[PDB]
Amino acid sequence: AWKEKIRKKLKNEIKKKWRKAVIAW
């Protein structure tokens, strides 16, 4: 990799999906 995925795309939603969606929180 090299494009760093532009920091994911809302890392699934900003992480795991926003920290799972603020679910991984």
Side-chain angles (χ1 to χ4, degrees):
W2 182 90
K3 201 85 173 297
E4 298 178 60
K5 308 178 171 290
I6 319 184
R7 311 184 179 165
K8 248 62 159 58
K9 298 184 180 291
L10 316 177
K11 328 217 173 46
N12 322 123
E13 235 297 88
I14 288 278
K15 272 152 193 180
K16 177 59 52 41
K17 279 183 184 64
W18 216 320
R19 307 187 194 171
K20 203 152 176 188
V22 198
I23 279 165
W25 175 44

